[PDB]
């Protein structure tokens, strides 16, 4: 997360860390959507141009975390994966279309002050909130700046980072990039004329873009950090998987499994 701030304790209790067993590595973020199901980006698990194809046994989900690096004894919970489900029409070529995956945990996780699921939107919540100018919130332990030889200082945060970012109109998203965008994506971030900063960055993928509903006081996950070009660049926006657009696949997987 670039130009965000440290999360408060329990501020994002649905945040999940996808953690590699060997070597130890932050692979991606993710989100808790029930006591046994975790949502993430497909490319966190499968991305052939980078020789990435993980199995269930290669990774762990760590829930309730704040520190990036500590083992937060009696605070975080570590869960093993029973099965990964990648969207059957995920397209890693091209433009990461339908960049979404589910992971079923081997055992249900107990909820706590630090661990609690986020809601998925229904059609009214998505129509009410997914509108240009409305801000959502992105969280992660990914890079604090676009990687660059000229950077000075620590590149990864001590604790979970948070940034609030406005949704951008689809034609502006489209025209900002030569990468082909689709209706399975939306973009967010400040426009040049707003003179502000903030973005997701490498290492944040899979984490949630959430919005608060004034209709019922609940937080909803509208997006998944998916891709961008650099981080916090002038004239660019971050791109997010559109969760509501892919919700029927989510529901199919959870109802079948």
């Amino acid at each position: 997360i670039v130009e965000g701030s440290d999360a408060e304790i329990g501020m994002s209790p649905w945040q999940v860390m996808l953690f590699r067993k060997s070597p130890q590595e932050l692979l991606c973020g993710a989100s808790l959507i029930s006591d046994r199901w975790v949502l993430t980006a497909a490319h966190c698990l499968l991305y052939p141009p980078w020789d990435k194809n993980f199995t269930e046994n290669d990774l762990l989900v760590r829930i309730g975390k704040h520190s990036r690096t500590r083992y937060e004894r009696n605070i975080e919970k570590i869960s093993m994966l029973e099965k990964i489900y990648i969207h059957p029409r995920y397209n890693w070529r091209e433009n990461l279309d339908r960049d979404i995956a589910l992971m079923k945990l081997k055992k249900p996780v107990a909820f706590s002050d630090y661990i609690h699921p986020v809601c998925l939107p229904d059609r009214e919540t998505a129509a009410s909130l997914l509108q240009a100018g409305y801000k959502g919130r992105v969280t992660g332990w990914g890079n604090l700046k676009e990687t660059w030889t000229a950077n000075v200082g620590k590149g990864q945060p001590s604790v979970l980072q948070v940034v609030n970012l406005p949704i951008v109109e689809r034609p502006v998203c489209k025209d900002s990039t030569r990468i082909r965008i689709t209706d399975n994506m939306f973009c967010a971030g400040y426009k040049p004329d707003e003179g502000k900063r903030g973005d997701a960055c490498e290492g944040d993928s899979g984490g949630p873009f959430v919005m608060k509903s004034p209709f019922n006081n609940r937080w909803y996950q509208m997006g998944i950090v998916s891709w961008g070009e650099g981080c916090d660049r002038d004239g660019k926006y971050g791109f997010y998987t559109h969760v509501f657009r892919l919700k029927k696949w989510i529901q199919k997987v959870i109802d079948q499994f």
Partner: peptide, 10 residues
């Protein structure tokens, strides 16, 4: 970099 997690996980 990361603190060791319990070896039961792994």
């Amino acid at each position: 970099d990361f603190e060791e997690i319990p070896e039961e996980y792994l």
